[PDB]
Tab-separated table of C-alpha atoms in Angstrom:
chain	number	residue	atom	x	y	z
A	6	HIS	CA	23.217	62.350	-4.718
A	7	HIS	CA	19.905	64.330	-3.720
A	8	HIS	CA	22.113	67.346	-1.339
A	9	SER	CA	23.889	68.173	-4.749
A	10	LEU	CA	20.738	67.618	-7.225
A	11	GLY	CA	18.607	69.614	-4.896
A	12	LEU	CA	21.053	72.787	-4.722
A	13	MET	CA	20.972	72.833	-8.243
A	14	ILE	CA	17.671	73.164	-8.642
A	15	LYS	CA	17.049	76.196	-5.680
A	16	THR	CA	20.093	77.941	-7.269
A	17	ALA	CA	19.026	77.284	-11.282
A	18	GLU	CA	15.796	79.358	-10.367
A	19	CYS	CA	13.846	78.287	-12.810
A	20	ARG	CA	11.372	79.365	-14.908
A	21	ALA	CA	8.501	77.832	-17.383
A	22	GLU	CA	10.251	78.562	-20.364
A	23	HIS	CA	14.063	77.770	-20.015
A	24	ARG	CA	15.695	75.408	-21.685
A	25	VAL	CA	18.255	73.303	-20.060
A	26	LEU	CA	21.401	70.929	-21.205
A	27	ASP	CA	22.859	68.652	-19.005
A	28	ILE	CA	26.264	67.192	-19.384
A	29	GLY	CA	27.054	63.701	-18.142
A	30	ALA	CA	23.420	62.541	-18.372
A	31	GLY	CA	24.428	59.255	-16.610
A	32	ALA	CA	20.830	57.104	-16.142
A	33	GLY	CA	19.115	60.697	-16.511
A	34	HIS	CA	18.169	61.958	-12.966
A	35	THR	CA	19.504	65.006	-12.855
A	36	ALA	CA	17.733	66.315	-15.893
A	37	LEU	CA	14.127	64.279	-14.792
A	38	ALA	CA	14.373	66.527	-11.707
A	39	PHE	CA	13.908	69.561	-13.208
A	40	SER	CA	12.031	68.940	-16.311
A	41	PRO	CA	8.569	69.544	-13.234
A	42	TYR	CA	9.703	73.113	-13.445
A	43	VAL	CA	11.216	74.121	-16.965
A	44	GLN	CA	9.769	73.984	-20.590
A	45	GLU	CA	12.538	71.643	-21.648
A	46	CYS	CA	15.736	69.424	-20.563
A	47	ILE	CA	18.229	67.791	-23.058
A	48	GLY	CA	21.252	65.550	-21.765
A	49	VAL	CA	24.108	64.412	-23.551
A	50	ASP	CA	25.720	61.020	-22.495
A	51	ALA	CA	28.993	59.847	-24.047
A	52	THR	CA	28.205	55.697	-23.706
A	53	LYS	CA	24.938	55.015	-26.334
A	54	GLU	CA	24.045	52.669	-23.360
A	55	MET	CA	23.248	55.039	-21.340
A	56	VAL	CA	21.463	57.829	-23.525
A	57	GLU	CA	18.883	54.226	-23.842
A	58	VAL	CA	18.751	53.961	-19.741
A	59	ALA	CA	17.850	57.656	-19.240
A	60	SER	CA	15.483	57.433	-22.507
A	61	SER	CA	13.500	54.567	-21.512
A	62	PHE	CA	13.919	56.040	-17.167
A	63	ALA	CA	11.934	59.268	-19.112
A	64	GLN	CA	9.600	56.416	-20.515
A	65	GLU	CA	8.888	54.857	-16.954
A	66	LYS	CA	8.357	58.085	-15.429
A	67	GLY	CA	5.921	59.109	-17.930
A	68	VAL	CA	8.108	62.667	-18.896
A	69	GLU	CA	7.374	64.213	-21.972
A	70	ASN	CA	9.564	66.973	-22.027
A	71	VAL	CA	13.366	65.436	-21.665
A	72	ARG	CA	15.234	63.598	-24.291
A	73	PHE	CA	18.870	62.685	-24.464
A	74	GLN	CA	21.393	61.948	-27.349
A	75	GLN	CA	24.820	60.547	-27.708
A	76	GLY	CA	27.718	63.295	-27.708
A	77	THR	CA	30.810	64.703	-25.244
A	78	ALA	CA	31.209	68.334	-23.696
A	79	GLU	CA	33.796	69.309	-25.935
A	80	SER	CA	31.768	69.498	-29.201
A	81	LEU	CA	28.422	70.301	-28.028
A	82	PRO	CA	26.219	70.035	-31.817
A	83	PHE	CA	23.663	72.815	-30.247
A	84	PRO	CA	23.585	76.661	-31.589
A	85	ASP	CA	25.561	79.221	-30.123
A	86	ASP	CA	23.097	81.098	-27.141
A	87	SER	CA	20.521	78.487	-26.324
A	88	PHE	CA	20.541	77.289	-23.669
A	89	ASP	CA	19.084	79.324	-20.465
A	90	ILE	CA	20.500	76.602	-17.983
A	91	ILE	CA	23.470	74.274	-18.206
A	92	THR	CA	24.357	71.182	-15.759
A	93	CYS	CA	26.961	68.951	-15.105
A	94	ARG	CA	27.267	67.183	-11.898
A	95	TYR	CA	30.058	64.474	-11.032
A	96	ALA	CA	30.671	64.486	-14.858
A	97	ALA	CA	33.730	66.402	-15.039
A	98	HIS	CA	36.241	64.903	-13.687
A	99	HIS	CA	35.380	62.420	-16.558
A	100	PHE	CA	36.204	65.152	-19.350
A	101	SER	CA	39.364	64.479	-21.966
A	102	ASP	CA	39.624	68.168	-22.116
A	103	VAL	CA	38.010	70.241	-19.656
A	104	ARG	CA	39.696	73.361	-21.506
A	105	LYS	CA	37.389	72.603	-24.268
A	106	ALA	CA	34.284	71.593	-22.134
A	107	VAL	CA	34.273	74.925	-20.801
A	108	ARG	CA	34.826	76.956	-24.147
A	109	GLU	CA	32.290	74.498	-25.684
A	110	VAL	CA	29.442	75.007	-22.560
A	111	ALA	CA	29.891	79.257	-22.624
A	112	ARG	CA	29.411	78.943	-26.105
A	113	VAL	CA	26.146	77.450	-26.197
A	114	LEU	CA	25.100	79.261	-23.208
A	115	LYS	CA	22.941	82.484	-23.553
A	116	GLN	CA	23.951	85.263	-22.261
A	117	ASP	CA	23.380	85.789	-18.773
A	118	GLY	CA	22.529	82.284	-18.817
A	119	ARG	CA	23.693	79.361	-15.502
A	120	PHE	CA	26.145	76.867	-15.444
A	121	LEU	CA	25.838	75.384	-12.633
A	122	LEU	CA	28.801	72.285	-12.294
A	123	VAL	CA	28.852	70.118	-9.295
A	124	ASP	CA	31.985	67.820	-8.691
A	125	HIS	CA	34.431	67.171	-6.468
A	126	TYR	CA	38.476	68.796	-6.575
A	127	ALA	CA	41.534	69.105	-5.754
A	128	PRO	CA	43.095	70.833	-2.886
A	129	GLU	CA	45.050	73.724	-4.369
A	130	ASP	CA	48.140	71.808	-2.406
A	131	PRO	CA	49.670	70.089	-5.721
A	132	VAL	CA	50.566	66.860	-2.907
A	133	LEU	CA	47.362	66.701	-1.820
A	134	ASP	CA	46.123	67.632	-5.672
A	135	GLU	CA	47.237	64.235	-6.950
A	136	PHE	CA	46.961	62.062	-3.818
A	137	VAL	CA	42.993	62.819	-4.301
A	138	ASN	CA	43.482	62.547	-7.582
A	139	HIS	CA	45.711	58.830	-7.796
A	140	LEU	CA	43.402	57.383	-5.414
A	141	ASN	CA	40.049	57.841	-7.731
A	142	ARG	CA	42.052	56.546	-10.752
A	143	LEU	CA	42.610	53.817	-9.009
A	144	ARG	CA	39.038	52.585	-8.381
A	145	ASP	CA	38.001	54.231	-11.715
A	146	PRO	CA	40.400	54.292	-14.984
A	147	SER	CA	37.833	56.267	-16.758
A	148	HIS	CA	38.845	58.885	-14.457
A	149	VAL	CA	40.558	61.701	-16.006
A	150	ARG	CA	41.353	64.240	-13.714
A	151	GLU	CA	39.383	66.801	-11.080
A	152	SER	CA	40.444	70.191	-11.375
A	153	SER	CA	41.527	72.823	-8.533
A	154	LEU	CA	39.200	75.801	-7.594
A	155	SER	CA	41.885	78.457	-8.889
A	156	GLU	CA	41.704	76.184	-11.695
A	157	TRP	CA	37.752	76.420	-12.391
A	158	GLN	CA	38.010	80.030	-11.764
A	159	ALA	CA	40.436	80.600	-14.632
A	160	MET	CA	38.696	78.462	-16.948
A	161	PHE	CA	35.395	80.376	-16.455
A	162	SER	CA	38.029	83.872	-16.809
A	163	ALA	CA	39.393	82.537	-19.821
A	164	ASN	CA	35.731	82.519	-21.365
A	165	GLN	CA	34.133	84.988	-19.641
A	166	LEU	CA	32.336	83.624	-17.178
A	167	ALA	CA	31.662	85.128	-13.903
A	168	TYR	CA	32.492	82.406	-10.599
A	169	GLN	CA	30.423	82.033	-7.576
A	170	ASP	CA	31.340	78.915	-5.127
A	171	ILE	CA	27.648	78.563	-3.899
A	172	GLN	CA	28.737	76.082	-1.325
A	173	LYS	CA	31.490	73.495	-0.436
A	174	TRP	CA	30.811	70.473	1.234
A	175	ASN	CA	32.948	67.216	2.031
A	176	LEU	CA	31.628	64.335	0.980
A	177	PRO	CA	30.910	61.560	3.146
A	178	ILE	CA	32.290	58.159	0.749
A	179	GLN	CA	31.752	54.207	2.584
A	180	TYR	CA	34.932	52.345	1.415
A	181	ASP	CA	33.392	49.307	1.122
A	182	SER	CA	30.415	50.338	-0.697
A	183	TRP	CA	32.783	53.029	-2.701
A	184	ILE	CA	34.869	49.505	-3.633
A	185	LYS	CA	31.712	47.058	-4.925
A	186	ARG	CA	30.359	50.134	-6.572
A	187	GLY	CA	33.314	50.415	-8.553
A	188	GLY	CA	34.121	46.764	-9.214
A	189	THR	CA	38.166	46.566	-8.466
A	190	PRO	CA	39.824	43.611	-8.548
A	191	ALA	CA	41.523	42.766	-5.465
A	192	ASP	CA	45.330	43.879	-6.842
A	193	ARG	CA	43.993	47.329	-7.652
A	194	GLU	CA	41.777	47.327	-4.220
A	195	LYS	CA	45.895	46.918	-2.281
A	196	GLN	CA	47.112	49.364	-4.256
A	197	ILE	CA	44.366	51.593	-2.608
A	198	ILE	CA	44.625	50.005	0.542
A	199	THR	CA	48.194	50.829	0.031
A	200	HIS	CA	48.148	54.775	-0.612
A	201	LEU	CA	45.515	55.381	1.917
A	202	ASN	CA	46.814	53.495	4.827
A	203	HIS	CA	50.851	55.437	3.660
A	204	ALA	CA	48.680	58.760	3.738
A	205	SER	CA	50.680	61.593	4.701
A	206	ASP	CA	49.501	63.926	8.069
A	207	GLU	CA	47.869	66.614	5.471
A	208	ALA	CA	45.511	64.114	3.432
A	209	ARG	CA	45.025	62.462	6.668
A	210	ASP	CA	43.205	65.163	7.682
A	211	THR	CA	41.935	67.187	4.401
A	212	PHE	CA	40.623	63.891	3.578
A	213	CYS	CA	39.517	62.313	6.625
A	214	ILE	CA	40.641	58.727	6.701
A	215	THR	CA	39.225	56.517	8.636
A	216	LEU	CA	40.905	52.886	9.224
A	217	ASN	CA	40.580	49.675	10.838
A	218	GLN	CA	43.614	48.566	13.390
A	219	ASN	CA	44.949	46.904	10.775
A	220	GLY	CA	44.758	49.154	7.527
A	221	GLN	CA	41.715	48.475	6.150
A	222	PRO	CA	39.988	51.365	5.153
A	223	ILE	CA	37.239	52.193	6.492
A	224	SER	CA	35.584	56.251	5.034
A	225	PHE	CA	37.305	59.184	3.391
A	226	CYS	CA	35.705	62.178	1.966
A	227	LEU	CA	36.441	63.920	-0.768
A	228	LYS	CA	36.289	67.546	-1.198
A	229	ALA	CA	32.538	68.945	-3.502
A	230	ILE	CA	31.650	72.363	-4.227
A	231	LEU	CA	28.124	73.582	-6.809
A	232	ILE	CA	30.100	76.390	-8.979
A	233	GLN	CA	28.542	79.154	-10.864
A	234	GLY	CA	29.088	80.682	-13.316
A	235	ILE	CA	27.509	83.627	-15.321
A	236	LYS	CA	27.821	84.061	-18.994
A	237	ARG	CA	28.880	87.823	-19.247
A	238	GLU	CA	31.349	89.467	-21.618
A	239	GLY	CA	35.230	90.255	-21.993
């Protein structure tokens, strides 16, 4: 996911004295990419296993200014106004309570600090919203919900973040590879195939659904965005 990462780095306007928090840090790629440009990166991930993976990956690359810990966005342990930049890349759809996550992000962000949020999102039309959320939940039972852009705008406003859409793009998904990386079993996959094959015309257009004549899916697109939040006042 080099495009989203490069976009975030570009948009962040990194300075050498900046402190960065990465929410849902995974194997540590986002934090490592920021590390040459800032003073310090802190990653939080929900699983102990990813915290250990990220830390050994930092060691293996010799970076000394990145640290990882276990935690969730819904309860960040950090003081108010402590980060210059907060990043969240393809993680929000896994939050158990996104409204509480944003409240926490806003709390720990410094005044005029930047929240850089990349995720795929639900179209405004509730039927397309539902189609894509169901598709992603079938493949990943960790999936909670991908919010609409309306919803993000309302959550930012609720927490005194200025909202800006930096870039929107279609995120192309190669079906065979997507199923393999999800480890989805045959019966779960059969449900995915039925879902894609029975898509409305509007869903087929919106999500760029490509199929074989025998109904075996080939590709589709998710709707991706980089949103920037800036902490202001109320």
